């Protein structure tokens with residue numbers, strides 16, 4: 001492959017999705033989450049030179065964050081909070097970039113992964129009412 | 140063309156505004172906000188070698204901040220606080236420059252965007268009583 | 280001119296003043312302020328190779344600060360606290376230099392400007408009992 | 420040898436395990452632990468160019484962490500908390516990498532080892548219900 | 560001159576004094592101060608290649624500090640706390656050097672000057688029971 | 700010698716020990732200590748290219764720490780806590796390395812030495828039930 | 840001649856001492872102090888290539904510290920706490936070296952000197968039951 005797949009974390013209780021394109025790398029990503037359930041519910045992604053917004057999950061959270069990524073801007077730090085198991089969920093995401101930008105979405109009360117780093121090219125996982133999530137990098 | 144448009148965040152309300160100058164960049168930017176409503180209400184911009192103030196929104200807030208930007212000075216840090224959805228609003232702004240200058244206006248209690256960075260060229264959105272909606276605009 | 284004029288912030292009131300000297304920069308600046316009114320009241324300036332003290336405003340404040348500036352020393356950070364509107368005032372000033380010197384005068388409870396930076400050449404505004412209005416002036 | 424062996428710390432108990440491959444260095448490692456027992460209970464490891472998960476221990480902890488390691492990324496900081504002696508246990512691990520990444524699992528209430536550093540090639544020890552014992556293994 | 564004169568701050572009272580020598584620069588300086596009155600009371604200075612101690616003021620303070628200055632060591636930070644006006648006093652001093660030495664004497668409850676910096680060549684002012692007034696003097 | 704001997708600190712009691720190997724430096728060192736007596740009780744050392752464990756003192760403490768030292772890794776910071784006098788003891792050790800590793804064993808409630816630094820080659824002292832006395836030994 | 844004498848601080852009492860070696864420098868220095876009296880009581884010094892201990896004062900303190908100094912290692916920061924006047928005493932010492940080593944002895948409740956810096960060559964002063972007085976001595 002021309003890609004590196006981060007471990008997808010939390011569970012199998014959703015519906016599979018893969019957002020990647022030759023169109024290029026991620027230019028913006030949004031996380032929607034709730035104080036009520038302390039979960040990620042909904043993610044949206046836009047790629048370089050492509051105005052289609054690829055969404056998954058139910059946008060029912062009372063909070064969202066957007067990170068915008070310059071074309072030459074990499075992820076140098078990355079943490080996903082989650083509930084472990086087969087009935088697992090993604091609870092939170094923390095990203096830090098080569099340009100000193102960072103975002104913090106949701107909660108981090110149980111399990112954590114510190115992922116591979118590099119140029120963010122896509123996301124894979126499963127979502128229904130809630131977000132499983134794995135990041136995808138270049139080389 | 141020459142420009143990177145940050146996502147306009149906030150609601151669909153307000154009177155539209157697009158303040159940009161060809162071969163010009165922002166030299167000063169003012170945010171007006173209220174403790175009462177925890178909203179941005181009014182913004183003004185000046186461009187390089189031009190004393191005319193491009194204003195939008197109702198200057199009814201009890202606080203304002205100005206950032207002045209040297210001609211060679213870029214935005215390296217940029218956050219807009221807002222309320223999401225169709226009846227959304229801009230609540231706050233945080234900017235930091237390549238020369239270590241920063242400003243903070245308003246509140247950050249719901250949604251955040253961490254925008255593109257670079258040389259600030261314009262702003263676009265909608266405003267009436269409030270800043271309903273705001274997107275920053277950079278060069279490349 | 281060979282000069283950059285920072286936004287004058289504060290009200291329209293007071294008697295106008297402009298302290299500048301042809302190719303000679305500020306080497307000392309004093310701010311006088313009160314706890315009672317939380318305002319700047321009085322400012323003095325001295326220029327390079329000139330022993331005249333240029334003053335404005337009523338020195339009725341219970342506090343003063345002086346910054347002295349080496350000939351090769353620039354302002355890298357600069358904030359003026361003020362009350363906005365026609366009935367406005369300067370409440371405070373914060374300066375930081377290329378040599379890690381800083382001063383803090385007065386209060387910052389309402390509005391702020393983060394100004395242009397560079398070599399401080401002069402100041403302009405209006406004052407009577409109070410500093411109604413203040414803007415800094417720099418070189419290139 | 421091609422390899423540097425950290426001291427195995429903890430007890431003599433559990434079923435012995437060695438996770439190493441001629442086909443690669445470690446690309447991912449997971450620690451599972453409990454607040455209830457203040458122990459490590461379960462570990463999993465994957466190597467470069469090999470899709471098998473090598474697991475040991477009972478995944479009965481209420482917490483897990485995963486660290487993923489870029490191919491060119493080394494361990495610069497490394498600490499294992501444990502209870503000493505024959506009936507000992509591993510209680511905690513702290514890892515920090517050449518790329519500023521770190522993870523922290525479990526507790527550090529008794530004994531500590533600060534290990535050799537370098538490229539992590541695998542782990543050795545014993546586990547049953549808990550991680551009785553752990554030793555890290557590096558290249559040169 | 561080949562000298563830079565920092566503003567003398569404090570009152571106009573006290574016996575006048577000038578401690579400078581062509582013999583050379585300040586090698587040691589002492590400040591004496593009181594908790595009771597929150598004032599500087601007494602100063603002593605020694606120069607390079609000169610064994611005289613030049614003293615002024617009444618050594619009635621319950622605290623003293625000495626800074627000793629290597630021949631090649633400059634002042635990079637300098638603050639004098641004082642009470643402004645005719646009946647003013649020096650209350651405090653903070654010095655920091657090119658070698659990361661600093662001293663702190665006395666109190667800072669009213670007015671401040673952040674002085675010119677450089678090689679400390681002497682001091683002038685007025686003292687009696689108190690240091691009513693102080694101004695530093697530097698080289699070029 | 701090709702060796703620098705740190706001062707042995709502690710009492711004159713216990714059985715004497717010297718752990719050194721010709722052209723072989725310390726690769727691992729363990730300290731054992733008790734909360735009950737706030738003393739070091741037992742130390743073990745291993746050298747480069749040699750699988751023997753050289754121990755001294757009674758391993759009766761409820762805590763141990765191990766430091767492993769990469770072949771090219773030096774001590775840049777070093778403290779031994781002790782009780783002074785003829786019936787003195789070692790209470791604690793604090794080491795920091797050229798690779799940012801640091802360890803802390805035992806207690807620091809009485810006397811301290813900040814030792815020579817460099818490549819740790821050996822240790823000398825005395826021990827019985829306790830570590831009576833300890834001195835580090837370095838290369839050049 | 841070859842030497843810089845720091846100001847001796849403290850009182851006039853005690854038995855005089857001057858510990859200096861031609862073509863030598865201090866390799867170890869010990870301070871003894873008491874919580875009871877908050878004074879330094881006793882000091883010992885060893886010089887390069889010489890095993891003899893030069894002592895002064897009564898070792899009656901409940902605490903001691905030793906600093907060991909590599910032959911190429913200087914003092915970059917140095918502070919002596921003391922009680923001023925004829926019946927004065929040394930209360931405390933803080934030393935920091937060109938290798939980031941530091942020690943702290945005793946108390947700093949009254950007066951301070953920040954001394955000259957450089958290569959520590961000797962000490963001079965007076966002591967009986969206490970260190971009445973101490974001055975450091977450096978190389979040119």
Ligand SMILES: OC[C@H]1O[C@H](OC[C@H]2O[C@H](OC[C@H]3O[C@H](O)[C@@H](O)[C@@H](O[C@H]4O[C@H](CO)[C@@H](O)[C@H](O)[C@@H]4O)[C@@H]3O)[C@@H](O)[C@@H](O)[C@@H]2O)[C@@H](O)[C@@H](O)[C@@H]1O
Pocket residue numbers: 151152153154266267268269270271
């Ligand atoms: O930026 C936010 C918003 O700005 C604009 O909409 C703001 C504002 O628009 C209208 O103006 C306010 C007044 O509208 C009418 O005159 C009337 O509805 C007024 O109601 C007042 O007076 C009546 C009668 O006495 C009272 O019954 C009421 O209680 C009020 O005291 C309004 O004050 C209104 O539609 C108002 O509701 C609205 O906030 C637009 O640009 C919009 O797109 C922006 O989102």
Ligand SMILES: OC[C@H]1O[C@H](OC[C@H]2O[C@H](OC[C@H]3O[C@H](O)[C@@H](O)[C@@H](O[C@H]4O[C@H](CO)[C@@H](O)[C@H](O)[C@@H]4O)[C@@H]3O)[C@@H](O)[C@@H](O)[C@@H]2O)[C@@H](O)[C@@H](O)[C@@H]1O
Pocket residue numbers: 431432433434546547548549550551
């Ligand atoms: O990593 C820790 C440990 O892992 C392994 O040993 C784990 C545990 O394995 C055994 O499991 C526990 C039970 O074993 C026996 O079936 C029985 O003794 C159980 O006890 C319950 O039931 C009996 C019968 O009614 C009663 O006697 C009891 O009161 C209990 O209600 C045990 O708990 C044992 O081998 C146990 O001691 C051991 O810790 C090994 O890999 C070991 O090497 C590691 O230390």
Ligand SMILES: OC[C@H]1O[C@H](OC[C@H]2O[C@H](OC[C@H]3O[C@H](O)[C@@H](O)[C@@H](O[C@H]4O[C@H](CO)[C@@H](O)[C@H](O)[C@@H]4O)[C@@H]3O)[C@@H](O)[C@@H](O)[C@@H]2O)[C@@H](O)[C@@H](O)[C@@H]1O
Pocket residue numbers: 852853854966967968969970971
């Ligand atoms: O560095 C400090 C100090 O050290 C030296 O001073 C020590 C001490 O020297 C003298 O000796 C102390 C004793 O003096 C007399 O023998 C006697 O007066 C002793 O007092 C105890 O017992 C008497 C009689 O029982 C009682 O009257 C007392 O209350 C005591 O219980 C003293 O302890 C004295 O000159 C004393 O004042 C002095 O400090 C010198 O180096 C000195 O220069 C230094 O300042």
Ligand SMILES: OC[C@H]1O[C@H](OC[C@H]2O[C@H](O)[C@@H](O)[C@@H](O[C@H]3O[C@H](CO)[C@@H](O)[C@H](O)[C@@H]3O)[C@@H]2O)[C@@H](O)[C@@H](O)[C@@H]1O
Pocket residue numbers: 687688
């Ligand atoms: O400059 C230091 C100090 O010098 C002078 O000292 C003040 C003393 O000077 C005079 O002797 C008087 O002002 C004296 O006043 C005390 O006794 C007085 C009776 O003579 C009485 O009326 C006063 O209330 C007071 O008890 C001062 O002590 C002078 O220049 C000072 O103001 C100056 O600070």
Ligand SMILES: OC[C@H]1O[C@H](OC[C@H]2O[C@H](O)[C@@H](O)[C@@H](O)[C@@H]2O)[C@@H](O)[C@@H](O)[C@@H]1O
Pocket residue numbers: 292293294406407408409410411
């Ligand atoms: O800076 C404040 C103002 O200075 C002048 O007048 C104001 C003053 O009038 C009276 O002399 C006093 O009682 C004051 O209390 C009062 O501020 C003018 O120059 C004015 O317009 C300025 O705003």
Ligand SMILES: OC[C@H]1O[C@H](OC[C@H]2O[C@H](O)[C@@H](O)[C@@H](O)[C@@H]2O)[C@@H](O)[C@@H](O)[C@@H]1O
Pocket residue numbers: 712713714825826827828829830831
């Ligand atoms: O290493 C410290 C000392 O260890 C032993 O002394 C400990 C105890 O030994 C016996 O229990 C009694 O003598 C006790 O009084 C004593 O504390 C000896 O090895 C001694 O030499 C060591 O200094």
Ligand SMILES: OC[C@H]1O[C@H](O)[C@@H](O)[C@@H](O)[C@@H]1O
Pocket residue numbers: 013014015127128129130
């Ligand atoms: O979020 C978990 C979720 O699982 C799927 O997405 C659906 O089957 C939901 O109705 C259930 O509520």
